[PDB]
Symmetry: C4
Subunit: 197 residues, 4 copies
Amino acid sequence: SRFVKKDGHCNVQFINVGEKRNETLVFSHNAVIAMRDGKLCLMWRVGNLRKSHLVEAHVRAQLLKSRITSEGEYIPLDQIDINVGFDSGIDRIFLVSPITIVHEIDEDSPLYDLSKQDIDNADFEIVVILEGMVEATAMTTQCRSSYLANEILWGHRYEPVLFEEKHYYKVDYSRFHKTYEVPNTPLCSARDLAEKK
Amino acid sequence: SRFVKKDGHCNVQFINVGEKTLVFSHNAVIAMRDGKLCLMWRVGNLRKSHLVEAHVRAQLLKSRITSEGEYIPLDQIDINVGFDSGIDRIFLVSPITIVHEIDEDSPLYDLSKQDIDNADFEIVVILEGMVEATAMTTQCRSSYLANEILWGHRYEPVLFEEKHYYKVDYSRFHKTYEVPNTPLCSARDLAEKKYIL
Amino acid sequence: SRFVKKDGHCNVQFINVGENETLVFSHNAVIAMRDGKLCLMWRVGNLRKSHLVEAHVRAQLLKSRITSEGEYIPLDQIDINVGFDSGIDRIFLVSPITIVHEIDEDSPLYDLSKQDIDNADFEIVVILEGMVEATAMTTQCRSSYLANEILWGHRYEPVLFEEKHYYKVDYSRFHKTYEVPNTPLCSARDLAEKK
Amino acid sequence: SRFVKKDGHCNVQFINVGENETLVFSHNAVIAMRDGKLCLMWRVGNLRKSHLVEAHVRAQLLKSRITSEGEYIPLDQIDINVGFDSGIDRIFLVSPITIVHEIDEDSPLYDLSKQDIDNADFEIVVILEGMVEATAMTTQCRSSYLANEILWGHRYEPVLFEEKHYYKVDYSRFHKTYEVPNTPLCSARDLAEKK
C-alpha cells in the first residue's frame, strides 16, 4: 500500500516494458491540451523505462518559432520558454511511475491566445527536455523530444498506467502513449475562457 | 567551543552510531514552532565525510479527482521545505530537523489531528547531494504514512556541548517526546482563532 | 518539417564549421533595439558534435570603483542580467544562440550612450557553463568584450537557414553583423524618460 | 589592457602565495559601511591553479535558541543572505573576492551594534562550493568566524594591482585590513530608524 518503503525502495512493478533497446528516458508520442483544476493546460508524459532512480531530475520546454521584431530583425527560430514549474521549483520531479508534465496556459503563456481551431493551422514546434543523473553513474543525461502543432491532441487525457494492487503498485507501459477524448473540453483559447467569466 | 574550525573540520564527536550512510527519522511529527504549526522530520549523516550541495525535498503522494472528474492514481503534491529562499539547502553535520511551515499554501493546511488519525496519504522525503571526495550524486529516500506522523511531539536533542567539543548521541536520533500543550485543530483553525482579534 | 525529431536527434547540419575546440563566443558584442528595448547582445555557439547538458549563461561588468565611503575596489564585478530571475539564463544550445541583456533601470549600462561607449572604460566577462554529453565534467567557456568591442547599432547576421527537409547552420556568418542606422544614439535612460 | 582574454585565459599573475594550495577564507571577517549599508564581509580565494566552475557561497549563523513554545534548539542554523535571491551568490573567482552580506531588516544581525558583537558568543559558518576545472569532483571549503573574530570598523587591504599589461594578485595582503574610524557603532536598525 505504500509507494515508497522506509529504506528508500519503491513498491512498484513494471510490466510490458519491452526489450532493453528502450530501458531509458521516454516521452509520450503525443501531447495534449485539456482542463485541469479549472485551467486549460498543455500536458505531456515522461517515463523512465530504466530500473534506476534519476537524481535531481527536472523538466524544461520551449516553443520554437521564427519571428520578426518591430525593428524588422528576422530571427530564425526564436526559443520561447514554456513554464512547467521553474518559479516554484516544481519543474523538479521525482520520477518512478510515468509523470504528466503540466504547463498552465495563463496570460504569460505563448499559447494563451490559441484555440483548437488555431492549433489546427498552427505552424510551431514544442521541444521538451528531461535531465537528471542516472543512479550509480557520474553522468547527467539529457533526454529530448518534440511536439509539432498537429501532434497536440486537443481535448484528450492520458490513460492511467499506475494501478494499485495488493500491498504493491504496478505500472503498465502498454498504456503509456494511450489517450482518450473528453468532449466536454472547451474549444476556445485560454484567453477566451478568461474573459468568458 | 566552536563547532567548525578555521580549517573546515568540525569539532564534533559521534557516539552510539550503531553498526554499519544517510538516514531519516523513523517517525515524523507535527508541533508548534515559533507560533506556527509545522510538519517536521529528521535527517542525519552517519558517514564521516561532509555532504556537498545537499538539499531536501518532500512530496505528498495521494490519489485524487480533479474538478473535471479526472482520476489520478497517485498525484504528487510538493511540500515546501524552503526552496523559495534557498533554505532547502542544508549544511548537514549533526542530525537536522527539516521544517515544513504549514501555512495557507500547504496541502496540510486544513488537517487537524483527528483528520490525520483517519486520513490515508503518504509523505515522501528526499535528500540529495554529493559525498565528499566523489563524483557521484546520491539520493536518499524515505516516506511517512499518515499513521507515522506523531501529532504533538518533538524530537529528542542529540547534540550536546562539552568542555571543548560537541557530542552527537545517535541513540536518540529516532526518539521523540510528547507535548500535551499542542493544539488538536488544523493550521486554518489556528489562523481564524487569531484573525478574529 | 521539424528541428528536433521524436527520438531527440536534431535535424540540423553544420557547414563551414572549420578544422575546432568546443564552445565559442562571438568576436564582438552588439547593442541594438529589440521589441522596444535597447539590448546588449552576444552570440554563443557549440561546434562540438555533442549536446551541452544543463547549459546556462552569466555575465559581469568589471570596473574599478570608489565606494561612496571612499573604499577602493580594484575590479568590482557587477552582474549583468541574462534571465536568471525567470530561468531563461538556461539554454538549449544547438544552433548558435543570441544571449540577450535588456538594458533596463537595474542594468549598469542604463546610462551609457553610443558616445559614452566610445569613451567608456570597462570589460564585460561572459560565461557559458554546462556538461558535455556523456561526461561528468562541467565545462566553463569564458570570454570578454571591452567597451570598444561593443558594436553600437549592429545586429548579428542569421546563421540558421531552412532547407528542404533539414536545417543548416552556416558558421561562416557566426561573427558577422550588419549595421542598423536606425539605432538610437542616446542611452536607455533617455529613451525611458522620452515618454 | 584586459583581465580576461578572448580565449578565456586571464591576464593575472599571483605572487607571495607560498606552497599552490586550495580554497581559502580570510582569517577575520569585517563589518563596515558599503554604499550606504552596514555590511558583514569576508574574503575568499582560490590558491589553486585552475578555475572554479559553478562556484557559489553560503553562510549560516549557529546559535542555540528557545522557541516561544519553550523548545530548546541546541544549534539553530540561521541563514545569512549573500545573494541567493538575485543569483549573485554565484561567483567567478580568479582574484580574491569579498563576499558581502547586507545587514537589513531580515538579517539576524540587524539588532547588533559594535558593543553587542563584543559580548556576543555566536558563530558564523561560511561555505564555498564549486567544481575544480577539468575534474568531475565538487569541492566544499568551510570555515567560521566567532563573534570575536569579526572586525568592526575595518575593511580589507587590496590584493589586486594593475601592471602595464597584466594584473598581479598579492596574497600577502589577503588577510590584512585597515581601520575606518568613521564607521557607525550602532546597529543597522539604529541607522535605519535614524531617518
